[PDB]
Write a protein that binds this DNA or RNA. Structure first.
Lengths: 778, 184
RNA sequence: GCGAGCCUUGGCCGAGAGGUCUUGGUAAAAACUCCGUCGUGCAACGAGGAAUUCCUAGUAAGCGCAAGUCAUCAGCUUGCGUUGAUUACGUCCCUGCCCUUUGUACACACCGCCCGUCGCUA
């Protein structure tokens, strides 16, 4: 068959909320670029959407982005504002063009995600420490073989000087390690922690540290035999980050105690009045602090899914702090938090998602207006067919009536509930409302305009349907999903006894109960053919049902995490699965097999619905946004020919006016082949070699005996090979003439017999020296 | 413990029996392929007593039933002959894949061990070639009464599926003459 | 050296069944050794290509005999007897398969910690 969806990175998605800030980077001075679930471009003093880098169509590339989901770790601009560089929640670091959003290089070699990433003062080096507990230096070529420093067990925090040499390090394993740049060796490790280094800042000359121990340690730069001058104890809780002023006359510190405080005579004490402030520090613990590039403000990055602006009391800057400004969001992070329910209209232009405090109106990606009465999140949402009014179910058991035009509530629907509303859906014409409640009954609701004594705009409750006392061992009376027959003939209900019951529109008569469920059911739906159904349960198992009982068609079981929602197609041919494990799967309604497996989801999907147009995909989420869809001996001969080729060349160097074997002397390779060779069958490789191999060979023995080296060999090896070649051939069957190597042997053997005679005398005194006191100790 | 096998034929070979002798030759490390210049030797007892071999396999052809597989334990002297049904045209092959030193699992079907236990005694004494004691191939002996079947198979496993591979020349035989051997 | 170790012509006698005599077509130890004579036309495929297989002594090849059904001819089969070369006596190079040592992303589970949902009670 044919199904929608694509394998591309973008299908007009609005899935990026541009939220959850953790860091930032200053750019042109009048602007500032922000780490979010994208790269976002804000003004430094107004807060408007200057630009935004996200997924899309880069110039000259497909399935490429400007920025990824799966939250950015760090984000900074180059000092010449020519290079963009972001490390993400994956180990690959992505650099980007500054004018365009094409990619320049992709940087891997990281086992884990980035915990440190910053430009150096040269610009030709980019340093990245990641959560695989090491540091990786980067060159514009991509040189990773320069320096890989690792003696850690946890991540690293503190780093660079500004002198091309003489690095420093503070790490999250409670350690502060000292290293030189030339041939790196841990000269000294200063430790004053027991936990994690949260933030780090050098002021200009004093390196303070912030950790779990809720204290401040100062340290001097020119350091040896540790320089300690004092500690500032007990801010009140463990400190998280700090920042120096760009003029370097103050030093601001921040913690998770909702407070920030700076030092001034900087000093070792806080000596400035702080009651001048008007815009108190923060409502949520902040991640990172940077001074603003206008030299008058402070820029704060919080964990309340948004970052803010303030100022520090001083005469040069603003002596108070101003109200925080936020960017021009599309009304996706201009309001507060996550989406638990979505609802669909029949005009493909009214799509509403709800939050803790907002209802947001959408056509495709353009936001019309907000509606605010929310006393919680919404478990269910439902438009009127026609999109005139919308009906809301909050986490109070309250249903709310909202007009399409304005934010104002027309009518509060009667709170006859005592628990929150699980399910709710209207009928075809939309005059009957069936709801989710633990009140042991089914509540039908009227609906019309307000022109009579029965309010249809307040939904007066005439009929009572209640027989719900079915006894079971799991849970007797609670409902999760309710479904209206598309023929308007019956009502389908989810029940907590691992069953479902089917019953027509009037008074209770029984059609069908379905059971066999190890876990209770999450969602139940009906095909528009109205012959077969599906059901989703908490056992990772999706069950197809027609009209029988107990004869299992198929246990649709291929999953690992809990199942949020599985629904049919609006023309009943494709049922789809959204779950906890951040993947949405298409499944053919006529077959058992999958046609497309959509995995571009990083955060949790709570709900997902497709309109009756079927050309786009609406998805509730945990990042509150919507992803819209569609042999050896010859090597010895080479070794001796290379080695004598070196020695003969070095002989007439200037007494008479090759990069590798391996060493400063080539003869060390000659022993190394003796080191590499096995102790067995070496005589077969030795017996091949001719007499000239011997004449080339003894020069290396004279080389090591004049070299006095026994580090890379030993005398039973040399005498072992010597005794082999004197077995093989020869002295007077290879030469009858008195030659120079022949006279060389006569002194080399003297060197050998003396060199072994020394150690033999050493043992010969040693063991008899050991005997004599053992005679006495009795 | 492990047997010792000698392949012995008449003087003149045929290609329809040359390929068949090479499949029986695929019973190493103890199967020797020997062509004699005589049809039978009068000194078959002599060399097997000399060399210490345990079994002799002789091939020929007659009319009353089709061609036979004669197997005889040398230190016991029994006579077990196996009427071959398919001798028409086998595969031209001396090896494929692994070695015959692999010890396969032994599978019998349609259990007859009242009088067919003598066949069970021989085949366990015959196809114990291989001290590996680990299964990498398998040979099935399916009965249909006096009918026997010999098929070689390899363990084929993918995506949890037990597949066998019909490998080697596929053999259909019937129990031909069992002459009562001696306790000597 | 294994063995025993068929269609009829015609004729004389007989009620009979048949018996008996002629005629004519059809069927059905070897190699070796010696001694003498002659000296290649094929009517038609005329020592058999691509390719492929097998083979280490009493073995390859060659030759004949006998048997089972035969007192009788297998396009069958099994035994028997005679003569009897050449080449490897290897190696682990290719190829293929085993057994040991060696190397490792991945990985039951145990430590501490972050993040997110909901909620208790003081």
């Amino acid at each position: 068959a044919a199904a929608f969806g694509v394998i591309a990175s973008n299908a007009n998605c609005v899935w990026i909320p541009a939220s959850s800030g953790n860091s930032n980077g200053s750019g042109p001075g009048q602007l500032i670029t922000s780490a979010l679930e994208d790269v976002n471009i804000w003004d430094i003093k107004t807060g408007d959407l200057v630009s935004k880098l996200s997924d899309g169509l880069p110039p000259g590339a497909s399935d490429a982005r400007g920025a990824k989901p799966a939250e950015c770790t760090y984000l900074e601009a180059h000092k010449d504002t020519d290079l963009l560089a972001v490390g993400y929640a994956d180990g690959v670091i992505k650099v980007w063009d500054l004018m365009s959003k094409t990619v320049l290089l992709n940087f891997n070699g990281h086992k884990a995600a980035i915990t440190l990433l910053q430009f150096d003062g040269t610009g030709t080096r980019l340093i990245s420490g990641s959560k695989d507990s090491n540091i990786i230096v980067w060159d514009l070529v991509g040189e990773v073989g320069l320096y890989k420093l690792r003696s850690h067990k946890d991540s690293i925090t503190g780093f660079w000087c500004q002198g091309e040499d003489w690095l420093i390090s503070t790490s999250k394993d409670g350690m502060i390690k000292l290293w030189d740049l030339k041939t790196h060796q841990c000269i000294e490790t200063h430790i004053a922690h027991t936990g994690e280094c949260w933030g780090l800042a050098v002021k200009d000359d004093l390196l303070i540290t912030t950790g779990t121990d809720s204290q401040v340690k100062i340290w001097k730069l020119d350091i040896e035999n540790d320089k300690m001058g004092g500690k500032l104890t007990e801010m009140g809780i463990f400190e998280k980050q700090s920042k120096q002023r760009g003029l370097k006359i103050e030093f601001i510190t921040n913690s998770s105690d909702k407070t920030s405080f700076f030092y001034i005579q900087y000093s070792s004490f806080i000596l400035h009045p702080f009651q001048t402030i008007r815009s108190l520090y923060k409502i949520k613990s902040a991640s990172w602090t940077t001074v603003s590039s206008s030299k008058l403000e402070l820029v704060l990055t919080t964990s309340s899914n948004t970052i803010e602006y303030y100022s520090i009391p001083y005469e040069k800057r603003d002596p108070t702090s101003p109200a925080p400004l936020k960017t021009h969001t599309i009304e996706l992070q201009g309001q507060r938090t996550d989406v638990r329910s979505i609802d669909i209209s029949d005009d493909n232009k009214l799509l509403a998602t709800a939050s803790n405090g907002s209802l947001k109106i959408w056509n495709i990606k353009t936001h019309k207006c907000i509606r605010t009465f929310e006393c919680g999140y919404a478990l269910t949402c439902k438009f009127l067919p026609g999109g005139l009014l919308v009906i809301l179910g909050t986490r109070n058991g309250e249903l709310q009536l909202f007009d399409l035009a304005s934010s104002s509530l027309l009518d509060t629907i009667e709170d006859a509930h005592d628990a929150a509303i699980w399910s709710l859906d209207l009928t075809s014409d939309g005059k009957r409302l069936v709801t989710g409640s633990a009140d042991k009954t089914v509540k039908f609701w009227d609906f019309k305009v307000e022109n009579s004594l029965v309010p249809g705009t307040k939904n007066k409750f005439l009929p009572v349907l209640k027989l719900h006392h079915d006894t079971t061992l799991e849970l007797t009376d609670d409902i999760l999903c309710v479904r209206v027959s598309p023929d308007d003939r019956y009502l389908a209900i989810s029940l907590l006894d691992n069953t479902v019951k089917v019953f027509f529109l009037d008074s209770m008569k029984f059609y069908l109960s379905l059971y066999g469920h190890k876990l209770p059911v999450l969602s139940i739906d009906i095909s528009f053919d109205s012959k077969m159904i599906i059901t989703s349960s908490a056992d990772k198992n999706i069950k197809i049902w027609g009209l029988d009982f107990g004869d299992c068609h198929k246990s649709l079981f291929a999953h690992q995490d809990s199942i949020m929602n599985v629904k049919f197609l609006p023309q009943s041919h494709n049922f789809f699965s959204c779950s906890k494990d951040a993947v949405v799967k298409y499944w053919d309604g006529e077959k058992f097999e999958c046609i497309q497996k959509l995995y571009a989801h990083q955060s949790e999907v709570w709900a997902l619905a497709v309109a009756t147009d079927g050309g786009f995909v609406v998805s509730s989420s945990h990042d509150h946004s919507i992803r819209i869809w569609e042999k050896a001996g010859e090597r010895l001969m080479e070794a001796l020919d290379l080695g004598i080729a070196e020695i003969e060349g070095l002989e007439a160097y200037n007494r008479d006016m090759v990069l590798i074997a391996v060493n400063k002397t080539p003869e060390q390779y000659i022993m190394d082949t003796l080191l590499r060779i096995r102790m067995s069958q070496l005589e077969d490789a030795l017996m091949v070699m001719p007499f000239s191999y011997v004449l080339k060979f003894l020069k290396f023995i004279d080389t090591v005996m004049q070299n006095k080296t026994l580090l890379h060999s030993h005398l039973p090896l040399i005498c072992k090979n010597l005794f082999f070649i004197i077995k093989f051939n020869h002295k007077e069957l290879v030469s009858q003439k008195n030659e120079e190597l022949k006279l060389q042997i006569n002194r080399v053997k003297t060197e050998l017999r003396s060199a072994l005679k020394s150690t033999e005398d050493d043992l010969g005194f040693n063991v008899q020296g050991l005997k004599f006191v053992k005679q006495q100790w009795n | 413990m492990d047997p010792r096998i000698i392949v012995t034929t008449s003087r003149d070979p045929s290609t329809r029996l040359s390929q068949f002798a090479k499949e029986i030759k695929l019973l190493f490390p103890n199967a020797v392929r020997l062509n004699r210049g005589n049809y039978v030797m009068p000194n078959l007892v002599d060399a097997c007593k000399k060399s210490g071999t345990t079994d002799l396999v002789v091939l020929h052809e007659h009319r009353g039933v089709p061609t036979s597989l004669t197997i005889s334990h040398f230190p016991h002297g029994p006579t077990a002959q196996f009427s071959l049904h398919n001798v028409v045209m086998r595969h031209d092959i001396i090896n494929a894949g692994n070695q015959s030193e692999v010890n396969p699992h032994l599978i019998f079907d349609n259990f007859t061990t009242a009088l067919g236990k003598r066949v069970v005694c021989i085949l366990k004494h015959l196809f114990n070639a291989g001290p590996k004691k680990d299964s990498e191939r398998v040979i099935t002996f399916a009965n249909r009464g006096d009918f026997i079947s010999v098929r070689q198979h390899v363990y084929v496993r993918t995506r949890e599926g037990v597949e066998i591979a019909e490998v080697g020349p596929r053999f259909e035989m019937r129990l031909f003459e069992l002459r009562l051997g001696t306790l000597e």
